[PDB]
Nucleic acid binder design. Structure first.
Length: 122
RNA sequence: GGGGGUGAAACGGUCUCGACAGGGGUUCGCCUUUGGACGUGGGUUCGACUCCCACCACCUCC
């Protein structure tokens, strides 16, 4: 169930700020999440248009049996206010920073939320 | 091939804080409201992830 962070990142990049952003999941995705054999090995977030879609996040699809689910590595959108969103973007694509998946979990109100943060390292 | 069990740490009361769409409003700034994620389509409920309903999938029992 709940809280699973990205241990892959600490030794790779370094966080500047950290935002929290609800994600656009489907439902089975959510079940896969309530479990825990998904990985951020390689996953970061990117703005395809003006919206930010965390990508390469693999979420083992209802992998406690076998089921009739979805594309494990699907570009999942991210939610964040217009103001809270116009920022991070301007502090990034200069290719100096990177949107990397920090932690994942469900909030008080029961919603899976992702935690992102600026990055850089070598 | 039949039988049983499983499909959200609160055993009913949503607001995905946010993006994005669909409204109704607007001094075109913006305010307001609805959706969207809990395997799936179904109804039932003032309202449900949690109550029914099949159909699926896992596991399981002659």
């Amino acid at each position: 169930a709940p809280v699973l962070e990205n241990r892959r990142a600490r030794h790779d990049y370094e966080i500047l700020e950290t935002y929290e952003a609800g994600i656009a999941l489907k439902g089975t995705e959510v079940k896969s999440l309530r479990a825990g054999k998904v990985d951020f090995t390689g996953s970061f977030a990117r703005f395809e248009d003006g919206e930010l879609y965390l990508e390469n996040l693999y979420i083992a699809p209802y992998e406690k049996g076998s089921y009739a689910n979805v594309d494990p590595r699907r570009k999942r959108k991210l939610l964040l206010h217009k103001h809270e969103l116009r920022r991070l973007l301007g502090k990034v694509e200069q290719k100096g920073l990177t949107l990397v998946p920090l932690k994942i979990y469900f909030n008080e109100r029961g919603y899976a939320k992702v935690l992102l943060g600026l990055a850089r390292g070598k």
